[PDB]
Ligand binder design. Structure first.
Ligand SMILES: CC1=C(/C=C/C(C)=C/C=C/C(C)=C/C=C/C=C(C)/C=C/C=C(C)/C=C/C2=C(C)C(=O)CCC2(C)C)C(C)(C)CCC1
Length: 305
């Protein structure tokens, strides 16, 4: 088999494909409506969910771009934001596209604060969304919180126009303070070491669990193939997560492989314990126990656990 055919293991797993569906609809909207829709979603979400502050290093990396926008007149500030949403080719859009997701998120977090305070051009008073935009926002507001925050993050990541700029790599958790996960039905050492090393930010140990040609598929993304690319992804995008696997099932696969499905919850440091995303992991292990393929799926509902 191939990496691409391994994408088919456990085909009964119902992923929350409403998320990429909603992003596709969002992406069709007029840029000002995209910005207003997210503003509306963010303000209403903020009534029950508090977003964690961006990290200090992230803010320093975005500081020069933020200062440039803040110095513009209001019409130019709005144009710059529309440029990002339209994916226009401008210097600002190219800088934005060089950033990791967390830096992009912290950039918009700060702009949102400044818009609330009146120091950056706000969405116009009394703005009404287009017919298509209003329906997109309705869909978002009917989703589970874990799906709502995934829509927002994906919309942020998709902006700008395509070096790589990321936050510094955090030191792994010291061994004496690490916790160990417990998974009903699953004692497989590779799966357990995967969860535990990711929870400890121990990416150098984590990557050694993979085959040389192995791949990791994040939710609604294509597989990331090979140790170099997977390790880069861990270091740039996978810091400070909390994986809470609950239960799993283990089955033989072709050629002496083993396939394992685990379900549980994951927390992002942007929301902490206030949002638990419903997640499945689908592992395909070679005869020596190395990870040939692992897919991480956002599940359609808690009924998929
Ligand atoms: C834009 C915009 C605005 C600002 C919007 C802002 C500020 C939005 C902020 C949104 C945030 C902060 C969203 C954060 C979402 C984080 C998520 C959804 C993380 C999910 C991570 C997962 C599921 C990890 C899963 C993994 C596992 C478990 C593995 O085993 C391997 C690795 C990996 C695959 C990664 C304003 C308002 C101004 C209006 C104008 C436009």
């Amino acid at each position: 088999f191939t990496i691409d055919s391994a994408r088919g293991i456990f085909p009964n797993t119902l992923a929350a494909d409403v998320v990429p569906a909603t992003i596709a609809r969002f992406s069709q909207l007029n840029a000002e409506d995209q910005l207003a829709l997210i503003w509306f979603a963010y303000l209403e979400m903020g009534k029950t969910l508090t977003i964690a502050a961006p990290g200090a290093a992230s803010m320093q990396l975005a500081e020069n771009a933020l200062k440039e926008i803040q110095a513009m007149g209001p019409l130019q500030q709005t144009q710059a934001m529309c440029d990002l949403a339209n994916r226009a080719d401008t210097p600002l859009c190219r800088t934005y596209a060089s950033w990791s997701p967390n830096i992009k998120l912290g950039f918009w977090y700060r702009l949102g604060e400044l818009m609330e305070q009146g120091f950056v051009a706000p969405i116009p008073a009394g703005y009404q969304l287009s017919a298509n935009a209003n329906a997109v926002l309705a869909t978002i507001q009917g989703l589970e919180s874990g799906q709502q925050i995934t829509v927002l993050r994906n919309a942020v990541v998709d902006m700008g126009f395509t070096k790589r700029i990321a936050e510094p790599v955090v030191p792994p958790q010291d061994t004496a303070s690490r916790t160990k996960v417990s998974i009903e039905g699953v004692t497989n050492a590779t799966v357990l070491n995967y969860m535990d090393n990711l929870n400890a930010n121990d990416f150098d140990t984590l990557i050694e669990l993979f085959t040389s040609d192995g791949a990791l598929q994040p939710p609604f993304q294509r597989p990331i193939v090979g140790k170099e690319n997977v390790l880069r992804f861990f270091r740039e995008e996978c810091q400070n997560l909390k994986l809470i696997p609950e239960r799993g099932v283990t089955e033989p696969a072709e050629d002496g492989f083993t396939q394992i499905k685990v379900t549980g919850k994951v927390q992002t440091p942007w929301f902490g314990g206030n949002v638990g995303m419903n997640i499945a992991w689908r592992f395909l292990l070679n005869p020596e126990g190395k990870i040939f393929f692992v897919a991480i799926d956002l599940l359609a509902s808690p009924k998929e656990l």
